[PDB]
Amino acid sequence: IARKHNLHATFMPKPLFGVNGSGMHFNVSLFKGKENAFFDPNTEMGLTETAYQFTAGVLKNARGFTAVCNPLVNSYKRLVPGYEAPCYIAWSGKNRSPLIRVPSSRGLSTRIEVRSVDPAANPYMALAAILEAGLDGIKNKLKVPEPVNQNIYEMNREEREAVGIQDLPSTLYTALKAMRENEVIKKALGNHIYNQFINSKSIEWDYYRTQVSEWERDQYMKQY
Amino acid sequence: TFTKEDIRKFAEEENVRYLRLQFTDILGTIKNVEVPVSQLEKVLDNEMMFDGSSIEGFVRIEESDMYLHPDLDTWVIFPWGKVARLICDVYKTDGTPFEGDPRANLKRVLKEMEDLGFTDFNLGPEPEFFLFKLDEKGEPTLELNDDGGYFDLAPTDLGENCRRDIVLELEDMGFDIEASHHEVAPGQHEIDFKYADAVTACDNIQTFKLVVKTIARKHNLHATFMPKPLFGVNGSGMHFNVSLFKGKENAFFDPNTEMGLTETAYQFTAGVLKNARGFTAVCNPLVNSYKRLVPGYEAPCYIAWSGKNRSPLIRVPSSRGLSTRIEVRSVDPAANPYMALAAILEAGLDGIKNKLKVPEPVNQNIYEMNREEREAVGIQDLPSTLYTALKAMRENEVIKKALGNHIYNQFINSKSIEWDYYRTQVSEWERDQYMKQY
Amino acid sequence: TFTKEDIRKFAEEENVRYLRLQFTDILGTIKNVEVPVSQLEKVLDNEMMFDGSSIEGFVRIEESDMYLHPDLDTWVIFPWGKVARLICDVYKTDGTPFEGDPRANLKRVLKEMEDLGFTDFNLGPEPEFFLFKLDEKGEPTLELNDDGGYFDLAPTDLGENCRRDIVLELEDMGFDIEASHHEVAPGQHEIDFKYADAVTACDNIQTFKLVVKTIARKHNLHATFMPKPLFGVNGSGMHFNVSLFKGKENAFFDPNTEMGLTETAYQFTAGVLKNARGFTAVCNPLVNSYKRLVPGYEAPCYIAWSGKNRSPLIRVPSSRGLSTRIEVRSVDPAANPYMALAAILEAGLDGIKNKLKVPEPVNQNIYEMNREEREAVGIQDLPSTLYTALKAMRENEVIKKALGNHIYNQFINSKSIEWDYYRTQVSEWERDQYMKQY
Amino acid sequence: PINRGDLSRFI
Amino acid sequence: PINRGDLSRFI
Amino acid sequence: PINRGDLSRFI
Amino acid sequence: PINRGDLSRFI
Ligand SMILES: NC(=O)CC[C@H](N)C(=O)O
Ligand SMILES: NC(=O)CC[C@H](N)C(=O)O
Ligand SMILES: NC(=O)CC[C@H](N)C(=O)O
Ligand SMILES: [Mg+2]
Ligand SMILES: [Mg+2]
Ligand SMILES: [Mg+2]
Ligand SMILES: [Mg+2]
Ligand SMILES: [Mg+2]
């Protein structure tokens, strides 16, 4: 339809520098029979222990599936602070850029929002990875960490890590490095898909890393 | 008035396929949520959810979750399936209206006004706008659509007549247009509305801005409500003719006095004059706005009232009876209608309940007066910059009461950030004056 | 020192054929009267007549008749027959010096300082300037002459080296250059002078500006002392290192205290800090000047003193002995040297004779401080605009005493007119932000 | 002039 | 600024 | 202005 | 950044 209107539609995660990127936030919900498994009708917060285990599992393996959910080199240009994209592994109900957000809706519409996914990711693979991480958290009975609030904006990376907030990989190279060390993502993808994705992304990064960028020619070539 | 059944019938007969849930932020920008007509029921159940932090404008930090409650009386179908709109109030997750919504703030101000015995606050705006030509790439240029003057018949009958098409389309939509004319500056136009209640008047102002911007684009033109787009010509104002009513009767009308003004009207104008510096920032929210507030272009520059003057802050039209009103001329079309109307109403009520004494009206022998003599007489000057306007706003309690703490703080923060970004720019005027002389 | 016979001998041996009687107006512009050498005798008899209203700048009304009295100690011959110059004071027809001449005002201020026991007021300036490239038509462009950084060796040795040529030509003319270096911003340069007495220092500043502007033109460049020619890069300052002397001895030096600062120095800096808002308009006379006074570019933005800080208003260099001095960093190269020096000296003397107590110096834990906390501590902000700077100047008595009634009134009128012309312009920033959003 | 806005055609 | 994305008009 | 000629920079 | 002027090469 964009081509019909003499326009070009792009799902590139970060086509322009200095403006907001494009995300594909996933609101997911589990159901076991005409009933939301994340809804707690008695607790004031209204979240089942199953939901807490699911978000704990997603937070635990966030570095593992970052490469699948952010498969392009350009994707990690969106994962920079100041544009609402998540940059570290945390969950909250009210924050500027949490990795996991819990919307205020309850009842049959209670859900968990993973905000690291970009529109360039394969929906099937990203959904499989997220579901596998959630199930890994569920069947291990992991304890969800404390939600983050407004007093995290004034915190460097050292203090954030001291508290226990890990950072998402900043490049596709380091994202592949992290993915190669996670077993949950391999289980989610299957050996064939896992190996093919790793090979493809390694080749793509290898081709990208040898290019001389215009930023380098602007910064250098006169100063050196 | 409309009900749910009326809305369903209108959607069914008119084949409405698109719904626009329309609201506004603190900056006056027209925001909306688009919805397919299949969601109509969910729209009528006040169950549509959205961010809500967009109301904060460009100073929003964290995404919230807020509900949209439509007002069924604002239903209207655009003449361009079809597209319909509903103006919605913003509610928090606890079922109470959001304190940062200008429409809810104006409703609260009107509700607190109703405790003083007054029932209605009628507003008639006089919005002026500019029409510029578009280039090949579709960007606006600095060339005007015509070359007419005050009340000229410039866009005669054949070829664009954008003002006539705007008036006719507004009439087809169900608006009440009083008259339209060409303005003083070339390419400047004005369309006047019949008076309406405060909330309806502000909604009509927003819809008028949207319709004008759409129709100008239809005619390969660009419509702007910028207060002073061009140096050396007249700016655009949005003079507010306001009137108070306590029950089928104008509270400003005195049927016995020769002047025909009630003491209530004098108290109202005294209160507006007293707090004029307080609400100048709200009524003139842009940096460019204070480029309109310069002498020689009929924009008010000092705080005074008159019945016959070139540029008085408050003008009293010669009409009497049920149409007697007070005209505040400092408002510009870039101002948020709800916030400006709330500020003006609060200033008037502050004057009313304090029984303030209106100063003497100004007449022709004020044109030959410097600022020192003007201040010696008692005529204060309006703030000349957005920085000083914010400084004055921070010292006024009436504007804070009118806006509410949330809106007051957010507006101050937004305008301070805007001024801070503006002040660091090096203008072309500075490069022309300096860099060769220094 | 020179006498009439020395001037005649210099004219005869050097074949001087052109004389420039040089003076300055209240805006710091270098004015001159040209004369053939055959008029030399009439020059030495203090009989040359000229308008004199040119001292008023662009607010002059009526042509007057005033005499030029040259100062023979300022004689110097330009290296470009030959051209020589003499700096002249302006006298009225009654034989008394004109009260509107900044040089005479500075001399009067120094004379009244001498009654306090101090004999000399030494000044070392740090003027920074920008070099821009010229186009084919000979107009200045916005491209810089080089792309160096702080203390860089950018214009290495071959092809322009405009800074080196300026330094060498100044040395040939008889100046005392301490050092020169590349400044932080690309195309920005700084040349430092050895300290000299107040009048000689200001004359050297004027001559340096003239010589730089001539030599840059010689190299197909344009030299500008505009405070902030480019947005987003460092501006140009003219930091003043001042020191008081009462007889072959620095009055600021304490040989016993490990800090090495006399109580007189503390009183002087307290007085400068107290009246900083008063003389900001004189030290920053342009509209563009306050575009330099923005945080992040080392220009001072609030009133404080320190020995080690990023942007203190007053800095105390680590040097001691006879070279101990106080550095005022708010001055920009566009300021009139005589008027700015007189204002600074008057503020320092006001602090001295009132025995004011200097506030605590600021250190690293002020970077994380908002304006509210800064004001709670006691740190005032410098005026952010020329309008507010004039407002502050109108409320200070020390600046009026320093300038004299005539200069004070003329400067206020000129700057008010300049700001009035500036404020009515519609900037490109406003057209970018608005006209599509409104 | 007082009516500068009305005299814009000449200026 | 924390909300850099919302202030892109000024930068 | 009376001194129009001296204010030519601004006009 | 506090030292905005020194980082002008990157901005
Ligand atoms: N606030 C929003 O919904 C925008 C999100 C932002 N585009 C992102 O990349 O996540
Ligand atoms: N005379 C008029 O109606 C025009 C008013 C003028 N445009 C203003 O800014 O107020
Ligand atoms: N660090 C420096 O010497 C440069 C100072 C800076 N140019 C200013 O405007 O003060
Ligand atoms: Mg979302
Ligand atoms: Mg009008
Ligand atoms: Mg009117
Ligand atoms: Mg320097
Ligand atoms: Mg210095």
Residue numbers in the entry:
A (entry chain F): 223 to 446
B (entry chain C), C (entry chain O): 5 to 84, 89 to 446
D (entry chain Q), E (entry chain P), F (entry chain D), G (entry chain E): 1 to 11
From the paper:
To ascertain if this is a conserved mechanism among FBI-GS-GlnR complexes and to elucidate, in detail, the molecular mechanism by which low G + C Gram-positive FBI-GS proteins bind GlnR, we utilized single-particle cryo-electron microscopy (cryo-EM) and solved high-resolution structures of the Bs (1.96 Å), Lm (2.61 Å), Pp (2.07-2.28 Å), and Sa (2.15 Å) FBI-GS-GlnR C-tail complexes. Notably, the Bs and Lm GS proteins in the complexes were all tetradecameric, while the Pp GS in the complex formed 10% tetradecamers and 90% dodecamers and the GS in the Sa FBI-GS-GlnR structure was all dodecameric. D Density for GlnR peptide and contacts with GS in the Sa FBI-GS-GlnR complex (map contoured at 0.15 σ). Peptide density was evident for 8-10 residues of the GlnR C-tails from Pp (IQGELSRF), Sa (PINRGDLSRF), and Bs (FRQGDMSRF), and 5 GlnR C-terminal residues (QLPRF), in the Lm complex. These GlnR C-tails all form a distorted helix and bind within the GS active sites. In the FBI-GS-GlnR structures, each GS pore binds two closely juxtaposed but non-interacting GlnR C-tails as each pore contains two active sites, one from each ring. The GlnR C-tails in all but the Lm structure contains a glycine at the N-terminal region of the bound peptide (XG(E/D)XSRF). This glycine binds proximal to the E flap, allowing its amide nitrogen to H bond with the carbonyl oxygen of the GS glycine residue in the E flap. The GlnR arginine of this motif makes contact with residues on α15´´ and stacks with the side chain of the aromatic residue in the GS D50´ loop in the Pp, Sa, and Bs structures. The flexible connection between these domains would thus be minimally comprised of ~30 residues (calculated as the number of residues between the first and last residues visible in the Sa GS-GlnR and Sa GlnR structures; the Bs and Lm disordered linkers are >40 residues), which if fully extended could span >90 Å.
